[PDB]
């Protein structure tokens, strides 16, 4: 449940640290973004000399949420933060690493690169 104004950690080495969702790229008027949904974001905090810098308007895919996501098998999974991975217009990651676990929902949603770079897929 990410929506405009929501801050997210960036789980990659793109240089970003914190992004604030400014749009949920899901149809005409999606209220929320969950795992696997792409957002548009402003970069609110970056480390010096990165691929992205503070003030960039980037796209990112939500890779884990503090709201638990439910699964057709009757189980759920929840994380301790909202994290996302900065991507390009071809849904490819813009960094070389991703940090922390990601939700397996990314695989079925079409983000095979990120899932591979993930240390754990839960």
């Amino acid at each position: 449940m990410i929506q405009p104004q929501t801050y997210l950690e960036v789980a990659d080495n793109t240089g970003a640290r914190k992004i604030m969702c400014i749009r949920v790229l899901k149809g005409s008027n999606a209220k929320y973004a969950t795992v696997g949904d792409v957002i548009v974001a402003s970069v609110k905090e970056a480390i010096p000399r990165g691929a992205v810098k503070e003030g960039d308007v980037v796209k990112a895919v939500v890779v884990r949420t503090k709201k638990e996501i439910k699964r057709p098998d009757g189980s759920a999974i929840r994380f301790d933060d909202n994290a996302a991975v900065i991507i390009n217009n071809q849904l490819e990651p813009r960094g070389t690493r991703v940090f922390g676990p990601v939700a397996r929902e990314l695989r079925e949603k079409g983000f095979m690169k990120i899932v591979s770079l993930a240390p754990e897929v839960l």
Partner: peptide, 7 residues
């Protein structure tokens, strides 16, 4: 770098 910063 929390958590929002000042700078």
């Amino acid at each position: 770098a929390g958590x929002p910063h000042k700078r």
